[PDB]
């Protein structure tokens, strides 16, 4: 699985999911907010088998959220 960071406002899972699932599998992807404070950054932790992108997608310090440039690591 890996992780994700930046997690902008009102994005939700299925934005993280659909963004990984055509980077790979995906057969999870979920993002973490703050409790009735879904405005400053989070991480979410999503999951696809595809190593290979998670070689380079791991490395990217900026990715693009549908319309933000959050982050991926490995894990």
């Given at each position: 699985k890996i992780?994700?960071?930046?997690?902008?406002?009102n994005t939700t899972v299925e934005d993280v999911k659909h963004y990984f699932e055509q980077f790979g599998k995906v057969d999870d992807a979920m993002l973490m907010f703050d409790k009735t404070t879904n405005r400053h950054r989070g991480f979410g932790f999503v999951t696809f088998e595809s190593?290979?992108?998670v070689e380079k997608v791991c490395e990217i310090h900026f990715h693009e959220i549908n319309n933000k440039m959050v982050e991926c690591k490995k894990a």
């Amino acid at each position: 699985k890996i992780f994700v960071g930046g997690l902008s406002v009102n994005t939700t899972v299925e934005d993280v999911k659909h963004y990984f699932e055509q980077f790979g599998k995906v057969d999870d992807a979920m993002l973490m907010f703050d409790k009735t404070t879904n405005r400053h950054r989070g991480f979410g932790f999503v999951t696809f088998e595809s190593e290979d992108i998670v070689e380079k997608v791991c490395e990217i310090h900026f990715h693009e959220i549908n319309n933000k440039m959050v982050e991926c690591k490995k894990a």
